């Protein structure tokens, strides 16, 4: 379809966690989502929250409708469960790597299904469990998913990082290696 | 070994072009789109056999059909006018870094929005096209993009390499110069 811009409400439900997600994207960037537990709208950028508002009830109402149609489609499909599509993992920095200058390592997990995932940052083999940001399970036009994980770090020559990814389509955990000299 | 899991997805897509809005509503079981409304068609259509009961029932409810036919004006146009005044005004200027890595000079252009960008390599004032290898546009997920444009080079003493970047956030092109050593 010819389009200058594409604005999409995307939502899904499933048996395993996360059981529901409701978000809106503009030109493939998540602009806001409805936190289903807090029952409130979360804006990706603060400027969006100052300019816009969205009734969180609209997202909860559509999630319930999605759960209704899920039960109906489970029975109609004769309990058809789709195959596991394993994820593609890439790790790269946000900024040019300068030793001593704060940076953000990005782990991008792509083309996977179902949206069930464990991701862990390893710094010199040790998990980083705090101060780590992550995106929603982001939709793709082929109805698989992708996702971003973020790690603040200071580059140094001796350090080694790993994005450890677990998915049902993988025989073993997937480890994408990265270091300051990685191209 | 795979636990029992069923997935249901829904999409509501508005396509803005030339002052018009085209609305698409998709109903998906796992990864299979089975029902769809397209404002260019005006009614629901079954994409697979799983959607025939839905499309048949929904097309029989004129209240449902009239609501979906009005979405391009009531929701798509409404949301687009808001995004025009804020989201489409977002301008983040690219940051440009040139550094050496056979022998490759790398123009790392970072943290820019929107995504449309022009990056050109110049050697002693002449634009180069051969040995230029650009990554695709890399989406960082935080409403910023980055791109890496590599140039294979044979550096003589006194060669002047320039990476030039053009972007709607810039009133004039940004140039970063790297003078060859060796």
């Amino acid at each position: 379809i010819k389009a200058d811009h594409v604005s999409t409400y995307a939502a899904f439900v499933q048996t395993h966690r996360p059981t529901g997600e409701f978000m809106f994207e503009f030109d493939e960037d998540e602009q806001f989502y409805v936190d289903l537990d807090k029952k409130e709208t979360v804006w990706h950028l603060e400027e969006f929250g100052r300019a816009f508002s969205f009734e969180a009830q609209g997202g909860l109402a559509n999630i319930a409708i999605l759960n209704n149609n899920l039960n109906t489609l489970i029975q109609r499909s004769n309990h058809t469960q789709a195959a596991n599509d394993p994820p593609e993992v890439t790790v790269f920095p946000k900024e040019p790597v300068e030793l001593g200058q704060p940076n953000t390592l990005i782990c991008h997990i792509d083309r996977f299904f179902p949206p069930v995932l464990n991701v862990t940052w390893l710094c010199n083999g040790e998990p980083v469990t705090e101060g780590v940001a992550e995106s929603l399970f982001l939709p793709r036009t082929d109805y698989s998913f992708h996702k971003f994980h973020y790690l603040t770090f200071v580059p140094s020559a001796e350090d080694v990082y790993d994005c450890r990814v677990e998915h049902w389509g993988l025989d073993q955990p997937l480890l994408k290696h990265w270091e300051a000299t990685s191209g | 070994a795979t636990p029992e899991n069923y997935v249901y997805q829904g999409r509501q897509e508005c396509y803005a072009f030339n002052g018009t809005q085209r609305f698409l509503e998709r109903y998906i079981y796992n990864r299979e789109e089975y029902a769809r409304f397209d404002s260019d068609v005006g009614e629901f259509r079954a994409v697979t056999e799983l959607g025939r009961p839905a499309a048949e029932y929904w097309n029989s409810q004129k209240d449902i059909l009239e609501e979906k036919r009005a979405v391009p004006d009531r929701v798509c146009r409404h949301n687009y006018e808001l995004d025009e005044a804020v989201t489409l005004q977002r301008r983040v200027q690219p940051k440009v870094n040139v550094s050496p890595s056979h022998n490759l000079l790398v123009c790392h252009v970072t943290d820019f929005y929107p995504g449309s960008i022009q990056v050109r390599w110049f050697l002693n004032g002449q634009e180069e096209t051969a040995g230029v290898v650009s990554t695709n546009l890399i989406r960082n997920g935080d409403w910023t993009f980055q791109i890496l444009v590599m140039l294979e080079m044979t550096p003589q003493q006194g060669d002047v390499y320039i990476c030039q970047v053009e972007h709607t956030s810039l009133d004039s092109p940004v140039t970063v110069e790297w003078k060859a050593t060796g």
Partner: peptide, 16 residues
């Protein structure tokens, strides 16, 4: 009470 229910499209608004 409907097997095949349609989702409803709602828009965002200017901030309060």
């Amino acid at each position: 009470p409907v097997a095949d229910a349609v989702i409803h499209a709602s828009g965002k608004q200017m901030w309060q």
